[PDB]
Amino acid sequence: RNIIERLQDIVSALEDRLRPLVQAELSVLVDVLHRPELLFPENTDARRKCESGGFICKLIKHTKQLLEENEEK
Amino acid sequence: SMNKSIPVTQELICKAVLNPTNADILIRSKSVRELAQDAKEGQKEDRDVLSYYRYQLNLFARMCLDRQYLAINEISGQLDVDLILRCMSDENLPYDLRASFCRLMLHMHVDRDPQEQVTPVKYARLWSEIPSEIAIDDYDSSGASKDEIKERFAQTMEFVEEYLRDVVCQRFPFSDKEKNKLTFEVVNLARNLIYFGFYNFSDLLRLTKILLAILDCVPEKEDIMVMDTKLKIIEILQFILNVRLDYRISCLLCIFKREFDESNSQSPGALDFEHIEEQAEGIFGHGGRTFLRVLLHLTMHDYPPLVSGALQLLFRHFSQRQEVLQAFKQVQLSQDVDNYKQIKQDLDQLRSIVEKSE
């Protein structure tokens, strides 16, 4: 029955994966969209003390760290 | 010597104390009256406080990593659990901040070699074995007096509850050097949760408190490290979802009903995008209020600092919520042969290490 379970696992993974893949892409886009749209939790940043510079600043810092940081996984 | 974390020197220093044992003139009733004497803002009490401050480093140098000398460091430690209550009720903010460090070091040294942070055991019984989404019952015997550590955990969450109103003070009041004095208050107390493996729901509440502490207006050397500490504390919650998901999936899979009748979420091409837009309705507009978690990740990105990359990595990981958990299903890996399986895993790990070295 172990083989059957593994197969069932594969089928489940594919569905989860098709649906999951679509969901992941959407999540990233929104996060991507959110970054483009960095205003959701930035109502406090729009209240005061936040600039809405976003992703560009983050990207620069991240890039430097990653290059000099650990493995870029 | 303590900074070295260098063993031989520590042993020598420990052996060395026996002779003098002190530098000033000197305990439970004497300490509270000395606390009352320390209530007098001026001078002798200040000298006594300085001596005590140096003395914790006396525990701190003693508490580098050694288990043998920690047994020699022991009498002070029994006194320290009792003192630890004194660290709470004393209101010795600069004082008992060291008293927390010592206690944590002593407890950690005292028990359980395993250093229970990451739950590697993803499997279960041949059946689901009582799908138990309310209560987790993993080992129950890693500590012999699990309630003995749990009694410290009973003192733990109350001290953690002490940070709870402090969010309204560390955040309602701004960050200052006196606030940095209170910044030492949580300054390693969350690290005790890192060795802490006694329960989970309280950890979720603590994470919420950390986000709350994070926002109101707009560096913190230990404060960023306090955030760097809490960022490590966020990493433990990532294990929970996977474990729960794995158990649910396994239970559903096992029964004779296994023919495609599993459409359940762990937290239609347009329908996925509609659910994406519906999630975007939840986004742009453990099932609490998730918006604070997203906001916390963004806030960390805004905060920056040299440990900022670690924070950013945590944010990307947090954004994914089920995707690698499906890939975690492949990483999972017979009641009789399971020991040999365990032995094989250990051997395999050694082999893998050798391969990496090669």
CA distance A23 to chain B (A): 6
CB contact under 8 A, A16 and B299: no
The answer to whether B355 is a known ligand-binding residue is yes
Nearest CA in chain B to A55: B301
Q: Which of B215, B217, B304 is closest, CB to CB, to A61?
A: B304
Method used to solve the structure: cryo-EM
Total residues found in chain A within this entry = 73
Return all residues near B49 (Cβ < 8 A) that are at least 6 apart: B38, B94, B95
Contact B61, B13 (CB under 8 A): yes
Cα B300 to Cα A61: distance, rounded to the nearest angstrom: 13
Looking at the complex, does the CB of residue A40 fall below 8 Å from at least one CB of chain B? yes
Phi, psi at B127, each rounded to 5°: -95, -170
The answer to whether B289 is a known ligand-binding residue is no
Looking at the complex, does the CB of residue A36 fall below 8 Å from at least one CB of chain B? no
Phi, psi at A70, each rounded to 5°: -75, -160
Say if residue B38 is exposed, middle or buried (CB neighbours under 10 Å; 0-12, 13-18, 19+). buried
Contact B276, B192 (CB under 8 A): no
3-class secondary structure, B181: helix
Cα B217 to Cα B219: distance, rounded to the nearest angstrom: 14
B300 vs B85, B183, B211, B239, B319, CA distance in Å?
Answer: 34, 18, 10, 21, 14
A65 vs A53, B52, B223, B240, CA distance in Å?
Answer: 19, 41, 21, 29
> Checking phi first, is residue B210 left (phi over 0); if not, alpha (psi -120 to 50) or beta?
alpha
CB contact under 8 A, A44 and B216: yes
